[PDB]
Ligand binder design. Structure first.
Ligand code: SAM
Ligand code: MG
Ligand code: MG
Ligand code: MG
Ligand code: MG
Ligand code: MG
Ligand code: MG
Ligand code: MG
Ligand code: MG
Ligand code: MG
Ligand code: MG
Ligand code: MG
Ligand code: MG
Ligand code: MG
Ligand code: MG
Ligand code: MG
Ligand code: MG
Lengths: 123, 179, 101, 95, 331, 52, 77, 38
RNA sequence: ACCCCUAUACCUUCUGCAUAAUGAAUUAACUAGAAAUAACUUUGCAAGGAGAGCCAAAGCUAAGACCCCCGAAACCAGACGA
RNA sequence: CCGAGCCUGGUGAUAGCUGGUUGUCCAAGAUAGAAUCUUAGUUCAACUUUAAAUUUGCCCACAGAACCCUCUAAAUCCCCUUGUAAAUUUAACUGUUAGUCCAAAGAGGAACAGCUCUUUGGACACUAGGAAAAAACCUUGUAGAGAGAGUAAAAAAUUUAAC
RNA sequence: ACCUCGGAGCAGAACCCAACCUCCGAGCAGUACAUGCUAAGACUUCACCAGUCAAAGCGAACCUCAAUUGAUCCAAUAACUUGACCAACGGAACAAGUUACCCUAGGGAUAACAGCGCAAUCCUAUUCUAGAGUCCAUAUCAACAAUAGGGUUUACG
């Protein structure tokens, strides 16, 4: 109750909120690429580096090579030093290491729970 | 696109916003509460620009662009609510008070609410004299003591806001002589 | 309106089955000796005295909608809910001599 | 209702009252719930039971019913095996 | 109107501008643990709790643990999860170590300390054993809080422990009839010559537990005392069968008189209900008729009866009816 | 859309109850408690009472 | 996902999110109007609706063209 | 009735006006005027 | 006696009404609250009361005490009228 | 005196509509709402009165009564103490419920008109004094005689341009 | 265009309460088939009718949903049960126009004129100096504004 000194003890939603690099890891072998992707992701989790997605686009038509990508964000310029050095050293077998960026031309399907407050703030 | 019910509470009470001198010596202090039309602003820009050269002296809009809607027998136009105490227009540069006061107060005359062109020194001066007057008073009885104590049952007549208002505000009107 | 509110205030004596509160959503949560109905209506399971306290909330593991909220909550944080309690007044029964046999 | 009959000059009972209500000798009146036979498919079982029960009437309803009915209906009846025999008298009633 | 908080409000300190950097309770169980921790912490606001109120030992241990895990055959059991522990062996040497410490809790849970000695707890160091002989072949063990019928407990039990004088005591805490607080004294032995029990003097002869019918479960405790020097006990105990009003005493008042002389060492307590044996105790040993007790319940609540009980089922009238048989007045 | 239909029991004969079904659905055979026999028994359709 | 909101808001709610869009705007319902009596769009009391009918159509279409991906396909019916 | 905020100066309740009369500022005047003093 | 001072006729329908609106020239005569259930009050008798019938788980018998005046346009039946 | 003649009778037609209603004296005594072929009316409730039975009532201190919305005021509920004398229940009837103005919080969309509507409170259908006469502003209530006395509210202030 | 029920704008913290108006929905659907029987004590849309929660007990098993609805009589049925856009939604078993040929009882002139209130509209004067006046603010005009007064118009009340 408002006047009582216990007020707003039930407040919860203030603690939450209701309101970029891409790494290529292509290999011919399909037993190798995902393993190293796993490893990089684990390194990211440990050092508090935000990850978006690990997307995979289909194998090239025939001979056949498939691409594994990891999205990373929150990396500082200074911290990049340490990070990139390790991911270069850990390279398993002639895997093309790329660092790609969103070029403002690379929209998401919003969930029903997310849409209601979005609508509320829209109007 | 939303219509607003007319909340006259905005004009009531002292201005707590844009009451600070910012990179400028001279400003027009509002002594009352009113809504500014676009016509007012048109006059503002015209007069100030034609008076003094912008290279030597600079003028600053310290008031937001109109956004409060007005409903008329549907929304027709937009207005800006201003409470008493807001510096509406700031002016700075290598200049003197004597030479600016003329056009500045002339521009302030056309304002719908009461207003005064003031320097930094003059504004702070009047703040000082007012707060000296309140401690200098020879009347045992202030509005403050009576209102808060509920002395004569005066709260029956008074409003809840009056306690905050110290009796210095009555509608859109600010009384500086009141202590 | 729906006439929903607190029926029995703090330190009120309440017989078993009485309504403590009615609510559209879960404003007050059932505590000790307090049952909740189909319509979230709080009633006294025992005769006694009503108390209102703040207690730390742990939802049922199966109840995903609240569990997920807990998961998103940062470390060190605890949800508090208001809980209503009936402190029973009279002990369950007494032992009495019937006969010397 | 008819205060004075044209044939005998005495009060008359409203027969609408007699085929809906049971009056107990003590002064209470018993009714059934309205719509207890109506649309039972849509009603909930708890609702259904609340409907089947025979209820009492408040003071004003009871007063109105007594005015609408003659003294004959208020006498004491010693029926053989009426299922309402016990309810005719009160027990442990202080005001 | 607002009133400032009297104490540190929860979640106030831990908040930050950014949340993305912070670790969340990824697990349900994580939060659960923290919530439990919060329940123990005292709070300024109203809480449910308010109203519902040497060095070489380590060296040997590490050596023995290293020796145990050394054998490959031992570890072969655990990985196949077809592994066992000697239950008896664990029990045997637990009593030496963590026996008394656990036993303290049970005594305070059953409220022995609060009832016997007004909350004056002690750790029961000596591993006391009591056995009750049933026939010739088997004897019932008395643990802490165990259930034993007074049929079995009809004669003097066999008590054994490591010892170097002593005083042995048996009390029925809740057994008493005439007074609430008071207790009966079953059999008292003083100036016990160590391990040997029989040679010590018999102050009070053995009496079996006698809990009345429907009086529920009765707890009976053995108390042992470390007697440094012998004492003459002029307590007016008169061996004969007995008269109950002489068996009544207070353990607290008894120990008060002899605080400095002796100190407790071990406890063992058993619970019991009524049995057919108890009947013979009143009849033979006491020469009195058996008291029987019932658990009754308080009368049901009904609101004050109204003259016009509006929108009530017809059965409202039957709530305030005392008899079920028809009545006729003057008729 | 739905229709109300009457359900009678094979066993404990002389008891019936009412239920909803879609018109498009197959003829309804059900299991329900009969207090005549004080047992859970099979029930079968006889007729449609009304359309709802 | 089934939602019951104004279709016009979608343009500013979600953008560049769909590769395929189908826009079935409210029309005069020619066959339906000729046959159905009740709730007819042509009922003379509801004349006002028809005056604000054409603009609405544009609005709804536009919302689709704002929500579609670059190179995304919208069909209007 | 009328709104609390008006374009013109609203007429007060008499009681309130009597209050305004009583709680007016009084300036202190010295026994000897300061300008006349050296 | 007047002069002095104080004093916004009555009824009725409206929240105010001074006054606004109906009603009154004045005198005499005439001109408008009729009853039950149930309660209360005071008696007689009392597990019974009542001068058949009826009521009764202190009731029953008796008494006392409660329910206005004037006014339409109409509708129908039978006579009378060119 | 014919959109259906006149007379007698039914007939004291019916009228939620208008008008009227007859000795003296004293006492208690006002504006929650609901349904209604209903808002010119009834019925129920609320208030009101009388009689009866019995025990608490009013004022109240601590403790207590929500999150969400992105932000919250005068306050309100509950309530021992206390100061007080009323309250609930039972029996029996009537009658009343179209208000207006002022202060405050608001919304109507003219910063709005003794203009409309919701809430809190005051006043008016009861006496008296004062503001010019004066429903609503201020002072004041329990009744008679007096050629005694003390008081309450209670009478607007203001005067101006040289250099 | 409406008449019943539930929301959204108004609702600040027990209950109730932003009229009128402007808008959004409801006249169900899905899942069980113990949506069995019985019974302490309570809540309630300001009456009544209706509506709502529920301990314990007898017998078994190891509901979602904001509204989603309809009295009596009567009719159908062996019984159990069923029946309305009675939506004018507390529901008359079943009935439309026109009257300036009109009548009676009344209320007002809550429709208009007459009389009143505000002054949105309109009228007038001042205050500021843009800009005209082939130079020149104030011979005479006059921009964007502010400040006053009257009650002639047009609306509002
Ligand atoms: C013409 S129907 C669509 C055709 C039909 N669903 C089909 O696939 O054949 C369009 C519907 O859109 C609805 N609608 C109206 N306003 C809308 C809006 N602003 N946004 C989306 N739908 C709207 C109308 O109710 C209308 O029935
Ligand atoms: Mg009248
Ligand atoms: Mg007149
Ligand atoms: Mg002729
Ligand atoms: Mg009427
Ligand atoms: Mg009086
Ligand atoms: Mg009604
Ligand atoms: Mg009707
Ligand atoms: Mg009518
Ligand atoms: Mg109290
Ligand atoms: Mg009126
Ligand atoms: Mg709303
Ligand atoms: Mg109610
Ligand atoms: Mg309500
Ligand atoms: Mg049960
Ligand atoms: Mg209706
Ligand atoms: Mg003509």
């Amino acid at each position: 109750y408002k006047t009582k000194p216990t007020h707003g003890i039930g407040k919860y939603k203030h603690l939450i909120k209701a309101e970029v690099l891409n790494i290529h890891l292509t290999a011919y072998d399909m037993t190798l690429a995902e393993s190293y992707a796993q490893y990089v992701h684990n390194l990211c989790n440990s050092l508090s580096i935000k990850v978006e997605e690990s997307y995979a686009m289909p194998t090239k038509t025939i001979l056949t090579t498939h691409e594994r990508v990891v999205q990373i964000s929150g990396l500082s310029a200074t911290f990049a030093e340490i990070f990139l050095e390790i991911i270069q050293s850990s390279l398993p077998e002639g895997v093309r290491l790329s660092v790609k960026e969103h070029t403002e031309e690379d929209g998401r399907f919003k969930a029903r729970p997310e849409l209601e407050e979005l609508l509320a703030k829209l109007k | 696109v939303r219509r607003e019910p007319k909340n006259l509470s905005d004009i009531r009470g002292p201005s707590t916003e844009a009451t600070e001198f910012t990179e400028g010596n001279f400003a027009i202090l509002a002594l009352g509460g009113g809504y500014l039309h676009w016509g007012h602003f048109e006059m503002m820009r015209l007069t100030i620009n034609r008076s003094m050269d912008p290279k030597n002296m600079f003028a600053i809009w310290r008031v937001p662009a109109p956004f409060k809607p007005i409903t008329r027998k549907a929304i027709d136009h937009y207005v800006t609510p201003v409470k008493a105490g807001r510096l509406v227009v700031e002016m700075g540069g290598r200049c003197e008070f004597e030479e600016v006061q003329g056009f500045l107060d002339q521009v302030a005359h056309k304002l719908p609410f009461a207003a005064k062109a003031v320097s930094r020194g003059t504004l702070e001066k009047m703040r000082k004299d007012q707060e000296e007057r309140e401690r200098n008073n020879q009347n045992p009885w202030t509005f403050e003591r009576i209102a808060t104590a509920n002395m004569l049952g005066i709260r029956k007549v008074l409003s809840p806001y009056d306690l905050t208002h110290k009796g210095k505000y009555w509608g859109k009107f600010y009384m500086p002589k009141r202590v | 309106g729906r006439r929903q509110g607190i029926k029995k205030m703090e330190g009120h004596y309440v017989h078993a089955g009485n309504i403590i509160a009615t609510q559209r959503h879960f404003r007050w949560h059932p505590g000790a000796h307090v049952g909740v109905g189909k319509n979230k209506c709080l009633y006294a399971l025992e005769e006694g005295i009503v108390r209102y306290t703040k207690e730390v909330y742990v939802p049922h593991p199966r109840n995903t909608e609240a569990v997920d909220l807990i998961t998103r909550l940062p470390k060190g944080a605890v949800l508090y809910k208001t809980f209503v309690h009936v402190v029973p007044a009279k002990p369950e029964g007494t032992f009495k001599l019937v006969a010397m046999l | 209702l008819t205060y004075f009959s044209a044939r005998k000059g005495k009060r008359k009972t409203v027969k609408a009252v007699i085929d809906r209500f049971l009056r107990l000798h003590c002064g209470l009146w018993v009714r059934r719930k309205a719509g207890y036979k109506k649309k039972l498919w849509k009603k909930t079982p708890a609702r259904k039971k609340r409907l089947r029960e025979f209820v009492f009437c408040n003071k004003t309803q009871s007063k109105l019913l007594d005015k609408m009915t003659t003294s004959f209906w208020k006498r004491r009846n010693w029926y053989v095996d009426d299922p309402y025999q016990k309810y005719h008298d009160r027990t442990n009633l202080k005001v | 109107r607002r009133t400032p908080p009297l104490g540190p409000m929860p979640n106030s300190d831990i908040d930050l501008s950014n949340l993305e950097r912070l670790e969340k309770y990824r697990s349900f169980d994580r939060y659960r643990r923290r919530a439990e921790q919060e329940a123990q912490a005292p709070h300024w606001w109203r809480t449910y709790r308010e109203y519902f109120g040497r060095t070489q030992q380590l060296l040997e241990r590490k050596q023995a643990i290293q020796e145990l895990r050394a054998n490959v055959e031992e570890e072969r059991a655990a990985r196949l999860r077809t592994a066992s522990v000697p239950l008896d062996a664990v029990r045997a040497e637990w009593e030496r170590t963590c026996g008394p410490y656990h036993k303290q809790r049970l005594a305070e849970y059953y409220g022995l300390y609060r009832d016997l000695f007004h909350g004056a707890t002690f750790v029961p160091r000596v591993p006391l054993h009591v056995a009750y002989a049933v026939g010739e072949d088997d004897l019932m063990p008395v643990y802490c809080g165990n259930e034993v019928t007074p049929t079995e407990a009809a004669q003097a039990p066999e008590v054994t422990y490591e010892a170097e004088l002593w005083t042995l005591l048996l009390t029925s805490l809740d057994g008493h009839l005439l007074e609430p607080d008071a207790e009966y004294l079953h059999w008292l032995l003083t100036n016990i010559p160590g391990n040997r029990v029989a040679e010590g003097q018999v102050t009070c002869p053995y009496l079996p537990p006698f809990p009345a019918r429907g009086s529920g479960i009765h707890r009976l405790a053995f108390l042992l005392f470390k007697q440094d020097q012998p004492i003459d006990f002029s307590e007016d105990a008169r061996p004969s069968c007995y008269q109950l009003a002489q068996r009544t005493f207070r353990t607290f008042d008894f120990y008060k008189k002899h605080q400095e002389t002796m100190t407790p060492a071990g406890l063992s307590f058993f619970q019991c209900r009524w049995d057919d044996s108890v009947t013979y105790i009143f009849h033979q040993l006491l020469d009195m008729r058996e008291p029987v007790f019932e658990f009754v319940r308080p009368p049901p609540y009904h609101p004050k009866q109204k003259r016009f009980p509006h929108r009530q089922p017809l059965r409202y009238l039957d709530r305030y009816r005392d008899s079920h048989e028809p009545t006729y007045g003057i008729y | 859309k739905n229709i109300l239909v009457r359900m009678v029991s094979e066993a404990g004969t002389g008891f019936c109850f009412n239920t909803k079904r879609n018109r498009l659905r197959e003829k309804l055979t059900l299991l329900h408690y009969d207090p005549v026999v004080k047992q859970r028994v099979l029930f079968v359709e006889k007729k449609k009472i009304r359309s709802l | 996902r089934v939602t019951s909101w104004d279709g016009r808001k979608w343009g500013e709610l979600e953008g560049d999110t769909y590769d395929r869009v189908l826009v079935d705007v409210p029309c005069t319902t020619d066959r339906h109007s000729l046959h159905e009596e009740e709730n007819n769009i042509f009922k003379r009391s509801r004349k006002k609706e028809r005056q604000i009918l054409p603009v609405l159509q544009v609005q709804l279409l536009a919302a689709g063209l704002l929500a579609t991906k670059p190179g995304g396909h919208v069909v209007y019916s | 009735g009328s709104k609390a905020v008006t374009r013109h100066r609203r007429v007060m309740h008499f009681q309130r006006q009597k209050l305004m009369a009583v709680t007016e500022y009084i300036p202190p005047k010295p026994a000897i005027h300061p300008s006349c003093l050296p």
